[PDB]
Amino acid sequence: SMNPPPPETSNPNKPKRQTNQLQYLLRVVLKTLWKHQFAWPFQQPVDAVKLNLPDYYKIIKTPMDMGTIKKRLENNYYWNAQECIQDFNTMFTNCYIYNKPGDDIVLMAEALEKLFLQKINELPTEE
C-alpha cells in the first residue's frame, strides 16, 4: 500500500483570521509540545511505507499529527480555537487506537496529552 496524501493544510476557499487564542495555540501550546523530548513520533504524518506498517491506514482513517497542525495554524486554516484543539485530540486518540497498551509511544502520548491539557488551561481571552 501507498501512503495516503497528507491532510490538507491550506484552503483559500475558507475565510481567514488571526485571533489571540489561535496565536497562543501556535506560539505557546504547539511550540511547547513540539520541543518536548517525546514530540518526535507526532511531528509528521505516519509514513506507513517507510515504517512498514501496512495496517496503519486500514485502522486509522482520520490521521492527524503536529506537523499538520502547525502548517494549518501557519495557514490560518482554523477559524476557531476548538478546531485546532480537536485535531490534537484526534492525534492522541489515533495513537491509543493503533498502538498497544504499554508501548513506548503510548507513554509518550500520555505525557504530551497531559502537558497539552495543562497548556490549554492557560489560553488567553477571546475577542
Partner: peptide, 12 residues
C-alpha cells in the same frame, strides 16, 4: 490494535 511501532529508547 495493529502491529505497533517498537521501542523508542525509554525502557524497559
Amino acid at each position: 490494535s495493529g502491529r505497533g511501532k517498537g521501542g523508542k529508547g525509554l525502557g524497559y
